[PDB]
């Protein structure tokens, strides 16, 4: 699965730069090693800081402060496509930022044939205001009187003696 990490890093201090600036990024990766490499290439492509002359100063996994409250997360991401450039913004209702990112990765691999390396996440933000929600299906979930029967009921022990119920 995925875990959210904060990676703080800087280049090695020298005489030219006695106090190098400290760069922190919030990013998602299965483990710390992938997170550090994910961060290093991001730092290379944004600020041209080489991996050799830099160092990861702080690694910290982050847990969801309120995993028991359903939230709506809007995700700004950039995609590499045939043209090599695209921008998308999706909304997912889930109780955890990590799960929202996992759902985003599954949806994009399902729709646009996107892989982990092809997807770079710009921002995952929480949308508390109902009006700020843009997606109609999210608004459908947010309606106060939501109700619906179970979808995809679908139901070793081969050779059942009776016919299936698949109803109530």
């Amino acid at each position: 699965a995925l875990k959210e990490y904060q990676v703080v890093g800087r280049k090695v201090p020298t005489e030219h730069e006695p106090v190098p600036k400290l760069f922190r990024m919030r990013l998602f990766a299965p483990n710390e090693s992938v997170a550090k490499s994910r961060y290093w290439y991001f730092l290379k492509m944004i600020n041209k800081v080489k991996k050799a002359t830099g160092e990861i100063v702080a690694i910290n996994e982050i847990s969801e402060p309120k995993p028991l409250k359903a939230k709506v997360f809007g995700i700004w991401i950039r995609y590499d496509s045939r043209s090599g450039t695209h921008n998308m913004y999706k909304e997912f209702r889930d109780t955890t930022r990590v799960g929202a990112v996992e759902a985003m990765y599954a949806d994009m691999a399902a729709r646009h044939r996107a892989r982990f390396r092809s997807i770079r996440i710009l921002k995952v933000v929480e949308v508390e205001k109902k009006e700020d929600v843009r997606r109609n299906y999210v608004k459908q979930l947010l309606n106060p009187h939501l109700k619906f029967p179970l979808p995809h009921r679908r139901t070793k022990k081969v050779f059942a003696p009776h016919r299936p119920s698949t109803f109530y």
């Binding site: 703080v8 800087r10 090695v12 106090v19 190098p20 600036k21 400290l22 760069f23 922190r24 990024m25 919030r26 991001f42 730092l43 492509m45 944004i46 600020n47 160092e55 100063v57 702080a58 950039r78 770079r120 996440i121 710009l122 921002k123």
Partner: peptide, 21 residues
């Protein structure tokens, strides 16, 4: 060259800044 030794990295002077790709 040996591996880099443990040291300190004071941030009160330069607090970490959020970077987004």
């Amino acid at each position: 060259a040996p591996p880099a030794k443990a040291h300190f990295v004071s941030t009160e002077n330069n607090e970490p800044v959020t970077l987004h790709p």
